[PDB]
Design an enzyme around this catalytic site. Sequence first.
Site, short mmCIF file in Angstrom:
data_model
loop_
_atom_site.label_atom_id
_atom_site.label_comp_id
_atom_site.label_asym_id
_atom_site.label_seq_id
_atom_site.Cartn_x
_atom_site.Cartn_y
_atom_site.Cartn_z
N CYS A 111 0.79 -1.22 0.00
CA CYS A 111 0.00 0.00 0.00
C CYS A 111 0.83 1.28 0.00
O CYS A 111 1.49 1.61 0.98
CB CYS A 111 -0.95 0.03 1.20
N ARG A 114 -0.09 4.28 2.91
CA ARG A 114 -0.08 4.06 4.37
C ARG A 114 0.19 5.29 5.24
O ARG A 114 0.11 5.22 6.45
CB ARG A 114 0.89 2.93 4.73
N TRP A 283 -8.54 5.97 -1.70
CA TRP A 283 -8.94 6.71 -2.90
C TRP A 283 -7.97 6.35 -3.99
O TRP A 283 -6.95 5.74 -3.72
CB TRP A 283 -8.98 8.23 -2.67
N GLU A 288 -3.53 4.23 -11.94
CA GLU A 288 -4.25 2.96 -11.86
C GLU A 288 -5.26 2.86 -13.02
O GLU A 288 -5.37 1.82 -13.70
CB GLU A 288 -5.00 2.86 -10.52
C1 HEM Z 1 -6.38 6.59 1.94
C2 HEM Z 1 -5.89 6.28 0.68
C3 HEM Z 1 -5.33 5.10 0.20
C4 HEM Z 1 -4.67 5.08 -0.99
C5 HEM Z 1 -4.47 6.25 -1.93
C6 HEM Z 1 -4.27 3.71 -1.23
C7 HEM Z 1 -3.73 3.27 -2.39
C8 HEM Z 1 -3.39 1.98 -2.76
C9 HEM Z 1 -2.85 1.62 -4.08
C10 HEM Z 1 -2.53 2.56 -5.24
C11 HEM Z 1 -2.64 0.27 -4.07
C12 HEM Z 1 -2.18 -0.52 -5.29
C13 HEM Z 1 -3.23 -1.53 -5.69
C14 HEM Z 1 -2.90 -2.26 -6.98
O1 HEM Z 1 -1.90 -1.88 -7.64
O2 HEM Z 1 -3.64 -3.20 -7.34
C15 HEM Z 1 -3.02 -0.19 -2.68
C16 HEM Z 1 -2.90 -1.50 -2.15
C17 HEM Z 1 -3.27 -1.97 -0.85
N1 HEM Z 1 -3.84 -1.16 0.10
FE1 HEM Z 1 -4.04 0.90 0.03
N2 HEM Z 1 -4.64 2.89 -0.21
C18 HEM Z 1 -5.34 3.70 0.68
C19 HEM Z 1 -6.02 3.17 1.80
C20 HEM Z 1 -6.02 1.83 2.27
C21 HEM Z 1 -6.81 1.32 3.38
C22 HEM Z 1 -7.80 2.16 4.21
C23 HEM Z 1 -6.48 -0.02 3.54
C24 HEM Z 1 -6.98 -0.96 4.47
C25 HEM Z 1 -7.42 -0.70 5.78
C26 HEM Z 1 -5.50 -0.29 2.51
C27 HEM Z 1 -5.01 -1.58 2.21
C28 HEM Z 1 -4.25 -2.01 1.12
C29 HEM Z 1 -3.89 -3.40 0.82
C30 HEM Z 1 -4.13 -4.67 1.62
C31 HEM Z 1 -3.29 -3.39 -0.39
C32 HEM Z 1 -2.90 -4.64 -1.16
C33 HEM Z 1 -4.02 -4.98 -2.13
C34 HEM Z 1 -3.66 -6.11 -3.06
O3 HEM Z 1 -2.61 -6.75 -2.81
O4 HEM Z 1 -4.40 -6.37 -4.03
N3 HEM Z 1 -5.24 0.83 1.74
N4 HEM Z 1 -3.51 0.87 -1.93
N1 LIG Z 2 -7.57 -6.12 -13.99
C1 LIG Z 2 -8.03 -5.34 -13.01
C2 LIG Z 2 -8.47 -4.54 -12.01
C3 LIG Z 2 -8.02 -4.76 -10.71
C4 LIG Z 2 -8.48 -3.92 -9.67
C5 LIG Z 2 -9.38 -2.86 -9.95
C6 LIG Z 2 -9.82 -2.00 -8.88
O1 LIG Z 2 -10.98 -1.55 -8.91
N2 LIG Z 2 -8.97 -1.71 -7.82
C7 LIG Z 2 -9.51 -0.83 -6.75
C8 LIG Z 2 -8.76 -1.18 -5.47
C9 LIG Z 2 -7.24 -0.89 -5.66
C10 LIG Z 2 -6.71 -1.55 -6.96
C11 LIG Z 2 -7.64 -1.10 -8.10
N3 LIG Z 2 -7.02 0.58 -5.75
C12 LIG Z 2 -6.87 1.41 -4.70
N4 LIG Z 2 -6.65 2.69 -4.92
C13 LIG Z 2 -6.92 0.86 -3.38
C14 LIG Z 2 -7.27 1.61 -2.21
F1 LIG Z 2 -7.59 2.87 -2.27
C15 LIG Z 2 -7.27 0.95 -0.97
C16 LIG Z 2 -6.95 -0.42 -0.87
C17 LIG Z 2 -6.65 -1.16 -2.01
F2 LIG Z 2 -6.36 -2.41 -1.92
C18 LIG Z 2 -6.65 -0.55 -3.30
N5 LIG Z 2 -6.47 -1.25 -4.44
C19 LIG Z 2 -9.84 -2.64 -11.30
N6 LIG Z 2 -9.36 -3.50 -12.29
#
Ligand code: HEM
Ligand SMILES: N#Cc1ccc(C(=O)N2CCC3(CC2)N=C(N)c2c(F)ccc(F)c2N3)cn1
Lengths: 413, 413
Positions: A111, A114, A283, A288
Amino acid sequence: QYVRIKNWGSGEILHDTLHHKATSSCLGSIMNPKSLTRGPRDKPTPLEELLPHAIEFINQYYGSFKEAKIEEHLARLEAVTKEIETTGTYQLTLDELIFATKMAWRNAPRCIGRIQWSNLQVFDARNCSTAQEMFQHICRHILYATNNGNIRSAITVFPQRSDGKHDFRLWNSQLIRYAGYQMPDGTIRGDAATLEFTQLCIDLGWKPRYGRFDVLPLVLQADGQDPEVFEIPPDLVLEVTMEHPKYEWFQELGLKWYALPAVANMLLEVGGLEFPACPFNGWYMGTEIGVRDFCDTQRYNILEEVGRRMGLETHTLASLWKDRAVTEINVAVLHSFQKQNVTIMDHHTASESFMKHMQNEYRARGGCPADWIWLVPPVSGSITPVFHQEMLNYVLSPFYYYQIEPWKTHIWQ
Amino acid sequence: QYVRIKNWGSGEILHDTLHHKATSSCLGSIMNPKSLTRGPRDKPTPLEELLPHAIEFINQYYGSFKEAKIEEHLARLEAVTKEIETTGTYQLTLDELIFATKMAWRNAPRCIGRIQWSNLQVFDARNCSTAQEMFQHICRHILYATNNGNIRSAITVFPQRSDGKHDFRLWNSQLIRYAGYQMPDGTIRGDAATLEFTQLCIDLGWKPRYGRFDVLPLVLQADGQDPEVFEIPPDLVLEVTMEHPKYEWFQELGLKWYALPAVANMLLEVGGLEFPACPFNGWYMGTEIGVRDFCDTQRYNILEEVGRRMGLETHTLASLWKDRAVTEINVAVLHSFQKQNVTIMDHHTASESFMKHMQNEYRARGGCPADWIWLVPPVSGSITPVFHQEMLNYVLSPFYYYQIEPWKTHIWQ
Ligand code: HEM
Ligand SMILES: N#Cc1ccc(C(=O)N2CCC3(CC2)N=C(N)c2c(F)ccc(F)c2N3)cn1
Ligand code: HEM
Ligand SMILES: N#Cc1ccc(C(=O)N2CCC3(CC2)N=C(N)c2c(F)ccc(F)c2N3)cn1
Ligand SMILES: C[C@H](O)[C@H](O)C1=Nc2c(nc(N)[nH]c2=O)NC1
Ligand SMILES: C[C@H](O)[C@H](O)C1=Nc2c(nc(N)[nH]c2=O)NC1
């Protein structure tokens, strides 16, 4: 025997043999490793294991606030073990859950955002019991988090895993996500990345609108029963229509995207307990949508199209027309979100804030797990600070685990 | 105790403690891991170890050609072991070396250009004995490889490590590379990434020209003696002056770069034998110069400058002015190399060819070691095929190892 290697671009597979002739084999470049996945159960969590984990978490929790509260700590430790040998499992106090959800987030190595870890709304749905109630809690979550564009990070925690055959699970990958259909003329409309799940939905009684941006329905399963299909109230799905600040033909591509990025299928591990249903959201980061959702070949794939309308040498890789197109697409996205007053961040400012986060994290608790492959943006990598930053990727706890696709392992009365 | 973490951008350090609280810690995001480095010696290679390795290599070699030559194979195996118990070490036949150099290259997990692995000129300098002869062999190499712009891949193998205190070593990181000086007004001219080595050169009797692009000298050490300083004949260093195809003010930045990318300080391990001096080269990939050499903060750092001349909102990250600038810089480089008829390749066509290479490699010998972090370009990552490609990173043999900075571990009569 042989390691399986997947190319998520053409979906093709490869079997690696050579790795055996190794000397002293990294699984880093692997999307879904078992070390990160937390699968099913059949029986409760063996007391011998749960008890220690539970104690550890309660020490972490109490060993959290400045000037602790030893009395409460002991009492709590006392109370928990007591509750454990009396029921098997145990119940976390709202404050422990909140602490757990933030720490787990704090420990998400993948993430980039964070730095916000402390700002998190926690919806306690641990008392939920039916699919309709899940649907209601989710709607509340979607509404709260969307907040008419001013996105708010939130997570809603449903009932914990008890025996292992009474799991609450969201079958969707994310709360809001477009459907993909295989058309009669051989083409694929909408999001090709959801062709399967769309079909599963079709199979469960969902009416396909055969469009490029039809928001798929919620497919909830409560207690242990089969999943019921709930369509999401259109009023709740905020979308941003894409338009470029200079090229007026951009909006002619008739493109848009939802504003709420919410993960639906992960599992929250804490104190030995595990919640297999806890959708959370933050958000978006422009790249993305502009890069992955719009330029991936396996997705909407609009790069070739944007290049032509730009008058680029679309048939000459070396011309770097792709680098040009991708940039304008990225600006269209950012531009569009900003214009419609919908929270979003560019990958540049994101990388800088993470670096700051990381700095704080090492000072505060000497360390910060981080998956480099995931933190570096999909474009302009070295232009970003995190690219030149070495980092360690380890699984702490509480943690958010990936889990096995529910439709692969499930009953079906 | 604690793992050290370096940020190669600001050169700052961090001590990781948390990793101890791990569950089931990847070193993938680490630039120089010990598993990849092959250090010094004091005594020859213990016969018990060398013999097996030597046999293994000779089986690989002979088990290479279609319709083998069992007689020669046995004889060779026979001859080698024989030569080993008689001298301790042994001598590879020219063909084995050639086979070794290509295979080692073939096994370089961090090389995007391995599709060329079979096309390689091998200069046998195993009979070299003095620093002047090294200098002469290197010059020959530089001249052959440069070929007036039509770059040719080549490697020159000096004498193998014998005892461990008679090592031939090039102190330079690469054959051609600009010097960096700390100026009196506090500024740093040239390549800041070579401030130390430049000084070392100054220390060894080299005359500093205090310019932005002064090619550093060769610092060779033969047998075991101290390093002697040899200046490179200007006639041999081909350079490309930078100019943009549209902005005529680009050339006003007065920028250029050498055309020969040649690694100077790696070690070639084969059949238990190890050659600590074997400079080799391929040709450039635009992004190396346009992105790393020109836009890295720790380098020439011309991004801010190019942005202004482009009339971009240089003070607004979200404007994505960096993505715009970097692209024009990348095109200037490619443009300039092409105009001056100097071999080069864009990162896009490079990624495609690697993917093809990899495909061939799995078919041919089921596998192909690959370091994803290194194969994905420093910009436009997911726009490239290799980004969506899962890959395994393991150390085979023969292999090219990194080695300890000679000035850290060395005598000095
Ligand atoms: C407040 C703004 C936040 C932003 C801008 C943000 C942004 C992102 C982004 C850009 C990714 C990349 C996902 C991808 O490439 O597929 C990600 C992954 C991740 N985020 Fe955040 N995040 C936020 C909040 C959170 C919150 C509130 C949680 C959980 C309590 C969180 C948990 C995670 C986890 C577990 C991943 C791994 C997801 C995966 O492996 O598919 N994030 N986040
Ligand atoms: N192929 C594909 C594909 C995979 C994921 C999505 C999708 O809707 N995803 C939304 C969640 C995703 C990664 C993008 N994007 C974020 N900012 C994000 C977040 F704010 C908090 C936690 C997450 F784990 C996050 N991962 C759309 N298309
Ligand atoms: C013919 C064209 C070739 C091209 C275009 C090419 C290109 C590259 C590039 C772009 C890198 C990245 C370096 C970095 O990011 O610092 C690299 C690394 C590497 N290449 Fe190649 N290469 C070629 C030939 C060769 C040859 C002939 C050898 C050796 C026989 C070789 C051995 C290696 C090794 C060992 C690395 C790792 C270097 C390191 O870790 O610092 N390459 N190459
Ligand atoms: N900071 C810095 C820094 C590091 C390396 C260099 C440099 O001159 N390097 C030249 C060699 C370098 C990597 C770039 N670039 C190549 N195409 C290359 C090659 F063709 C063959 C083998 C390599 F190992 C190669 N790596 C310049 N500045
Ligand atoms: C194969 C490769 O690791 C994979 O396709 C990539 N996907 C992702 C990634 N990084 C992010 N943020 N999200 C991804 O899904 N790293 C690389
Ligand atoms: C820290 C980070 O791994 C490092 O700065 C990067 N350097 C390099 C890299 N990739 C290449 N090709 N060359 C590098 O030197 N990967 C990442």
